Amino acid sequence: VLTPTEAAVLRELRLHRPQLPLDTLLFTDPNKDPDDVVTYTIAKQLQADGFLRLTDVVVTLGDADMRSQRAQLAKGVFDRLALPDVRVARGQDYPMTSTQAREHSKFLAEGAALRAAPDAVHTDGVRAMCERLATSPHKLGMVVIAGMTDASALLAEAGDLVREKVASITIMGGIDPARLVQPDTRAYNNATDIHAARALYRRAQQLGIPLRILTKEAAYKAAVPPAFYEGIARNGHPVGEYLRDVQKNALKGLWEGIQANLIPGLDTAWFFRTFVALSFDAIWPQVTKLNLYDPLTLLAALPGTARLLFQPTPMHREGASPVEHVGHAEVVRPEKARLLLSALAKAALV
């Protein structure tokens, strides 16, 4: 069940269903934060409503065994969302410094019990995506909400196909100051594998495939409150309880760390200014602002939802391969984006 205003926004989106669902290839790094799994959850409702069909997911971030743990978790979540036919595969190796090893090996305890068995996920990265680009009668969309090792691998291995079978590439990323458009080395997903990010941004443009880049500023504007997570956990859906528990515990850990001055450069003032001697139970209720970067990227990737919420700004040189930017100014309906994200996640968890 939805609230009156949630039910209305979902009715409104439903007027804009496409004739055919858009087949979708997703590149993702779940269980180091809530974002990717919120995206899988809203994708379930978008699939149920005929906007997309999530055919293949390739998982990155970490060494080979870590990528398999993430892929097992993704497949576990798709199973619990009754998306039984999503094909999940581990992505390929990529270069990691010692500093990256620590961050890229983050795997939140709440996801451990959600993992499908190891043999439920595939080890051959983008092979199935290649075969599917070959045999699709209609163009597919590519959505990147993680590092780009595999997305770039796909454009490289199937460069012949992608030119005629991929409609757009939408990325949670960032555009470097200097230009062809190239990736910002500071943006998290680009920094996961910066050479692959450069190869992808560059090759998409050489191949004439439209790029749409959603940046962290777009999410700030449409940040959701804790009620978003409490709403989806309310009825005991395991994916809803996972999301609320991961967000609440991540935030608890950040609060406690700052309280003890253990996170250099951050302080109580930064925490109140970002999210708003206390225990975390007295802070959780004051929080009002939680970012959903990856779900917004997915909303930006589908024309039906994009036209509802966004007015992307073109960044390419007049006449060149299109590159659009979605930042704070381009999120034109943020309260509607908030309400639509809540509507989709609650409907998905029925």
CA distance 232 to 299: 19
Structure tokens at 34: 């809530």
Structure tokens at 147: 């590092």
- By beta-carbon proximity to Ca ion, the closer residue of 214 and 347 is 214
- By beta-carbon proximity to Ca ion, the closer residue of 214 and 302 is 214
State yes or no: 138 annotated in a binding site.
no
160, 164, 169, 175 alpha-carbon torsion, rounded to 10°: 70
State yes or no: 85 annotated in a binding site.
no
Q: Tell me which residues in 213-232 interact with Ca ion (CB under 5 A).
A: none
State yes or no: 36 annotated in a binding site.
yes
* Cβ within 8 Å of residue 274, ≥6 positions away: 289
What's the closest the beta carbon of residue 14 comes to Ca ion, in angstroms?
Answer: 27
- By beta-carbon proximity to Ca ion, the closer residue of 145 and 151 is 145
CA distance 114 to 74: 8
- Determine if 187 is a binding residue for Ca ion (CB under 5 A): no
* Cβ within 8 Å of residue 52, ≥6 positions away: 21, 22, 23, 24, 43, 46, 141, 302
* Contact code string over 56-75 relative to Ca ion, x by CB under 5 A: --------------------
Residue of 230, 348, 338 lying closest to 5 (CA atoms): 338
Segment contacting Ca ion by CB under 5 A, of 54-62, 126-134, 244-252, 293-301: 293-301
Residue of 241, 324, 301, 246 lying closest to 27 (CA atoms): 301
- Determine if 326 is a binding residue for Ca ion (CB under 5 A): no
State yes or no: 145 annotated in a binding site.
yes
Structure tokens at 35: 């974002």
Burial environment of residue 22 by CB neighbours within 10 A (0 to 12, 13 to 18, 19 or more): buried
Structure tokens at 323: 């590159």
CA distance 256 to 247: 14
What's the closest the beta carbon of residue 145 comes to Ca ion, in angstroms?
Answer: 4
Residue at 141: amino acid letter? G
- Determine if 145 is a binding residue for Ca ion (CB under 5 A): yes
State yes or no: 93 annotated in a binding site.
no
Segment contacting Ca ion by CB under 5 A, of 144-152, 252-260, 300-308, 329-337: 144-152
- By beta-carbon proximity to Ca ion, the closer residue of 251 and 283 is 251
Phi-psi label, residue 15: left if phi above 0, alpha if psi -120 to 50, beta otherwise:
alpha
What's the closest the beta carbon of residue 335 comes to Ca ion, in angstroms?
Answer: 24
Q: Tell me which residues in 12-51 interact with Ca ion (CB under 5 A).
A: 29, 35-36
- By beta-carbon proximity to Ca ion, the closer residue of 146 and 300 is 146
What's the closest the beta carbon of residue 90 comes to Ca ion, in angstroms?
Answer: 16
Residues making up the chain, counted from first to last: 350
For β-strands 140-145 and 22-28, DSSP reports them as: parallel
Q: Is 90 helix (H, G, I), strand (E, B) or coil?
A: strand
Total number of residues that touch Ca ion (CB under 5 A): 6
What's the closest the beta carbon of residue 242 comes to Ca ion, in angstroms?
Answer: 15
- By beta-carbon proximity to Ca ion, the closer residue of 158 and 219 is 219
In the list 146, 158, 171, 298, the residue contacting Ca ion (rule: CB under 5 A) is: 146
Q: Tell me which residues in 101-140 interact with Ca ion (CB under 5 A).
A: none
3-state helix/strand/coil string of 211-242: EEEECHHHHHHCCECHHHHHHHHCCCCHHHHH
- By beta-carbon proximity to Ca ion, the closer residue of 36 and 56 is 36
- By beta-carbon proximity to Ca ion, the closer residue of 133 and 143 is 143
Segment contacting Ca ion by CB under 5 A, of 63-71, 83-91, 141-149, 303-311: 141-149
What's the closest the beta carbon of residue 152 comes to Ca ion, in angstroms?
Answer: 16
Annotated binding-site ranges for Ca(2+):
29, 36, 145, 195, 294
- Residue numbers at the binding site for Ca ion (CB under 5 A): 29, 35-36, 145-146, 294
